[PDB]
Symmetry: D3
Subunit: 154 residues, 6 copies
């Protein structure tokens, strides 16, 4: 669609602990996407259980929440055309065992419960997660100097 | 078969975004041999000759003025299946269908800003090479690791 | 020198515009320093003037504040032994003309008015800048998994 | 499928000659696998023929054995969950013509007879090759500091 | 000031060892603008004229023969203080005295195989640029991040 | 002064624990040096005390020996012109606080008790260390395909 689509990208505590904050950001930076919001946070359990509210009945829900609480999280919002779908492709398959080398999980991850990062799965869930993690004023409005070279259209 | 040549060009957006080094390293690391290269600003006639097979498609007009909007790094790479493997390295022509690990899969988004161009066949490469380079610009040399890259041919 | 010393590292708008957020973070990640606070901000001019209060009489002061307002800023707090001193060495000479390759400015910068990044030049100035740019709750407390492999003591 | 599965990865003489020791090792280090054994060796021809015993009748056998004798080999044992299959995916397709960029052969190789590396194709074959190339005391036993961050279970 | 130019050349050992990409990335990442580049095998007379200030040194004949042994990636980079900063990026001419982080400190050992060359002065840059490049081969363009690299002209 | 000079480079347990094996090997590969011997070993305490015998009554000797036993070591022998002196320069200053960014320790280490790597400080000390760590048949004899492009003379 348009060049101002947004998604929610989070670096899970294992990605922070293993020193992958820089490399993960570079994947989206080099691809041509724009970072409009970022912050390192340790959110409370209530916020994490709301982010994973659709999985509260899954058997792995309790362990996932405790692991998302075990360390700091680098929450981000990236902007660009098809940033939701292409962003998930940059992260690789949700299960690292099925991820392709060259993707983030294909280069860095093994277990699905330690798959380093999170990405919104749809445009609707991206807006939901952006409002859950960020105040509207935490999204900075700016235009990349190389916009006309990344994009042929708005 | 190892003397097969292809034409690889870095489009103005690739030059503008500072991608000359990483793109050349991608072919260097694969083991291909660079036999010709120049930073060029070709005339509009040569570009329309390059995209001659697409002169009636709707996107032809904007394609010419955008290839004219900046310098182009033209290259000729030599190696076994360098035409097919070269395009695989560049990734899918539309970056939305490209895979991470390829040039477009790591750097591009829009098809009109897909950073690079690669010949799609051996015969088209031979024509693009003749159009973009004069014969004296193809340098003849042998890589010191040629026998470690190739088992034969 | 204790391992809990903190410093303030900021990626200036030219650093964000030129796609240097990833590599700059990786320089401090690979060295062994701990990121305890980070956020993408567009701070008000009063905060920027107060940050450069020592330079309010300098001739380049108004152009400096204006350039620091021209885009997003990645503000960071890094923690480690001698991180203030070593962080400045990682950034390189404030004038990139005098910086050495291998540092951030020796690799990416040219002009002193566009030197991509900022670093506190003293422990006490770091405490002042961290309190100026960050709220106390924005500094996340956590323990690196390889702490005992980076540090022999303290 | 536990996290102590082991595989045999070897850097062939062409990979050694072309300076690919570091990059190949980084591919396995970054993914999260543990290196338990490594040594630069120029093994006798009988060991190489035993390694490729299932190919002793193939036409390219003597040319393959001579090529495996033409220089040093970096023999390695990597340990991790599903390291045999994922290791083969990291190396790429056996014939680099069919390999994907982002894998080892998709980034550095061209000819199948010069595919820079080898990896075990099954768990049982891995145990055969580990015993073939390594004496038992050459397997180093240790625990990564980030084990609980790479894996969610044993 | 910002339109200063220097001559950077990747010597045959840099091309043979697959260092074209990494060397270009060093100047690209720093913020300098590539205005001219070509892969060329220049004649011996051009190389003897390039090192004319060394025709009395004993290593002169060996220097010319080794510069003839392979392709050379001749470049022209433009930027503020690009001559001096370019020399600093290359490192000490003798790699044993170069610091890691520079090109020679990362890739070279012997001074007779020091991978690259850079102009030592602004006026020697103009002579080397005019010797290696016709005026047409220099491309005039403006980087989209010029106002983010430089604060003033 | 010749090109067959040899030195002993060892990646200490912290370098192995922090995933720096590949990057460190790449530093010497890129420079043009030749790896003639390498093995991952867990050496006995006597060999380590025999290795650091010239520090037998320094205050840090017992802790240094314990730290060298706390994990696997990647022991290497690199060969090239002035590899002993240039190797130490590549590693950086023994104390990472005094090392320059761009070197191994300037990029990766902080404490001298966790300085990641070790290099021989003289040609004579290198010969003693190489014989102390490696059996003579563990040194592989081979010539790089790019020798004449790295060296102008023998
Ligand atoms: C199956 C599983 C998923 N998860 C996580 C991964 C995912 O982020 C989320 C469930 O997503 P999932 O349905 O498994 O994959 P996808 O997002 O592609 O549809 O929960 C775990 O943490 N542990 C698990 O065991
Ligand atoms: C569709 C499209 C193609 N092109 C260019 C890209 C390609 O180099 C060329 C051919 O497009 P296309 O035939 O769709 O892909 P392929 O090269 O695999 O056959 O046309 C544009 O510049 N803009 C466009 O919108
Ligand atoms: C001289 C100068 C400084 N500055 C800014 C850059 C630096 O962020 C700030 C510090 O200047 P300076 O005191 O010279 O360096 P240091 O931080 O090591 O004490 O002044 C400019 O923006 N433009 C200038 O022309
Ligand atoms: C076909 C072929 C294989 N080989 C090598 C590659 C392989 O390492 C080995 C046998 O592997 P192979 O059976 O060909 O592929 P796969 O592992 O997918 O079953 O023989 C050659 O050296 N030359 C050849 O022509
Ligand atoms: C000393 C020496 C220099 N050269 C080359 C390096 C240089 O490119 C040129 C002489 O440079 P030199 O005077 O040694 O150093 P600088 O460039 O700093 O003035 O000749 C050799 O080829 N062999 C040599 O032995
Ligand atoms: C000073 C010091 C050294 N060491 C180790 C690091 C080095 O591997 C070894 C030599 O130290 P040192 O002799 O002080 O440095 P140099 O190599 O320049 O002579 O001793 C420690 O482990 N702890 C220390 O406090």
């Amino acid at each position: 669609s348009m060049s101002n689509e947004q998604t929610f990208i989070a670096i899970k505590p294992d990605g922070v602990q293993r020193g992958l904050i820089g490399p993960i950001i570079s994947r989206f930076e080099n691809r041509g996407f724009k970072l409009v919001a970022m912050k390192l946070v340790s959110p409370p359990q209530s916020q994490l259980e709301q982010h994973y509210a659709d999985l509260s009945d899954k058997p792995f829900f309790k362990g996932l929440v405790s692991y998302m609480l075990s360390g700091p999280i680098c929450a981000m919002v990236w902007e660009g055309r098809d940033v939701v779908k292409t962003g998930r492709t940059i992260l690789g398959a949700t299960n690292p065992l099925a991820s392709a080398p060259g993707t983030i999980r294909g280069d860095f991850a093994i277990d699905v419960g330690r798959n380093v990062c999170h990405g919104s799965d749809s445009v609707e869930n991206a807006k939901k997660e952006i409002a859950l993690w960020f105040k509207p004023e935490e999204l900075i409005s700016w235009k990349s100097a190389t916009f006309d070279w990344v994009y042929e259209k708005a």
